[PDB]
Amino acid sequence: FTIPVLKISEMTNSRFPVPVDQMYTSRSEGIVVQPQNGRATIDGELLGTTLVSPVSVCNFKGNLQAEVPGQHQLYQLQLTNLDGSPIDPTDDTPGPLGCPDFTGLLYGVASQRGPGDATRAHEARIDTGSDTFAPKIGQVRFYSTSSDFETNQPTHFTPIGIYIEDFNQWQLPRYGGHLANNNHLAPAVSPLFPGEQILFFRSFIPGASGHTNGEMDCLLPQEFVQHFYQEAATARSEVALLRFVNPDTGRALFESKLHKQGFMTIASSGDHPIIMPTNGYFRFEAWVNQFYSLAPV
Amino acid sequence: AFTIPVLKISEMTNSRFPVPVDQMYTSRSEGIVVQPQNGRATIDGELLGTTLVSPVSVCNFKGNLQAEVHQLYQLQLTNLDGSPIDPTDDTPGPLGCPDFTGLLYGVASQRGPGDATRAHEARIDTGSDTFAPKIGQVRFYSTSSDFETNQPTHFTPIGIYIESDFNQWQLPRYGGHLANNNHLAPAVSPLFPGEQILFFRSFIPGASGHTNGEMDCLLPQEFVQHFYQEAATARSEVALLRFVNPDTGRALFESKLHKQGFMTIASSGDHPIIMPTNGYFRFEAWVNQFYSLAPV
């Protein structure tokens, strides 16, 4: 079994198409950690709405069906899957792969190519928390400060950041609209062993407006998802022991438990970033059980 | 031991622009020098040009909003990973720097003071005289004046703006109009008769005007990452590959993966290489540059 050699700064966030900024740990007090993107067993089984492509999460693609009545510069998208295939509500997923897994005002740019090679693009916002947001059945709407959009022309939404007018990275959206309950969701995760906390790979996504640190925590960097999908090595135990080492010194910095279901934990207490030498990276050490005792920090 | 990751064309990421690969494509490249700087990696694991491993960083910019030169701003670039720009590096420019000339359309965002944020459309003319990323000098025009001076700023790429036109094979002057490029990954071309380079093409978004946004890269970003990661020794100058249909069982065609980091096939003319969706490349054997490939 193996994990690719990568510095924190070479990692890609698996919940938003941007690099990882830092490792971070938390008590996650009063919160259910149940992301749907960046979900993969160390076995190579992708969960939730997780796809392998690292530049597709939070992107949308589909036909510009029409403009909603009354509301201006608010457009209705008829989604296809990001790879072009038609949206299939019968799939055993909460929603289309790469679909945002948080509630908030997603800021981005909607572009079109057509008729012919004619193109146009403008800022756009999609409220993943709005009642009408129903990507599971292909119904998604975006607001734009421009009316320069063609009806029935291929359209794509490129994500950028969050717009604050609120952004809740742990609040799952209703993939099927206000009249449907989510299903097929990757399970929530949490540390079960005393003194441990989940280790997150955090990024500060861009803010388009208002106040926000745009904190976005994912359980595994996208590269680990791709590697597990690719290797499909058998999990010899429920926990793969990793050890963060500093190639510069030869010094190892701390150990972490990579759980079979796809998340890491460390022996730590409180909400704080895990600051380490820039060239540090994780390496597989051995197979242990969930009772393995880790030294703090 | 050499290997290439199992991937469908639709699972591949373009190495010159942060978007998925749309299709394989081949060309005579008539009257054109193929010398991209991004997506450059020897099958040995040696990264060339301005190539980085991160798949979401190419064509992005980061730095301080130094000042206004009307709604034209001067950036004081840092490397994408935060480290200061170092012109002494043996690279043409900072890693991930665009390797084409044109009007790059995107969005410039800021966070600061405190957790205050703001973002607006922005354009960077990688062909403009002032464009000098090798020394950290880059400017962006925005239809908004809502930008803070001396606040961390980031440029997220999106597409091309057509008004100076997009030329995917014209390298920008990384050091500004008063300096010549250097440390450039070498140009590549097919040397064997009847062969042409096999490109991994994507249609990047158009922000305005007419354009198919064709962007051809020599290797999908995943192969760059894999070679960087494996660093397996090249037993010969050419790694023979086969594109197989897992559905059926048999080969569709063969391609030669050159040690320097580019592929060629036996083909003639400019056209897309259309194959069954589940098809993917696999390493077959080590051959020399004289290996004869069957057409198509």
Numbering used by the authors:
A (entry chain B): 227 to 391, 396 to 527
B (entry chain A): 226 to 294, 298 to 391, 395 to 527
From the publication, what sentences describe this entry?
Norovirus capsid displays an icosahedral symmetry that is composed of 180 copies of a single major structural protein, the capsid protein (VP1), which organize into 90 dimers. Each VP1 can be divided into two major domains, the N-terminal shell (S) and the C-terminal protruding (P) domains, linked by a short hinge. The P domain is further divided into P1 and P2 subdomains, forming the leg and the head of the protruding P dimer, respectively. Functional analyses showed that the P dimer and the P particle, but not the S particle, bind to histo-blood group antigens (HBGAs), the host susceptible factors of noroviruses (see below), indicating that the P domain is the HBGA binding domain.
Most residues from 226 to 527 could be modeled in the electron density map, while residues 295 to 297 and 392 to 394 could not be modeled due to lack of interpretable electron density map in these loop regions. Similar to the protomers, the general structure of VA207 P dimer is very similar to that of VA387, particularly in the P1 subdomain region. However, significant differences were observed in the four loops on the P2 subdomain connecting β2-β3, β4-β5, β6-β7 and β7-β8, as a result of sequence variations in the four loops between the two strains.
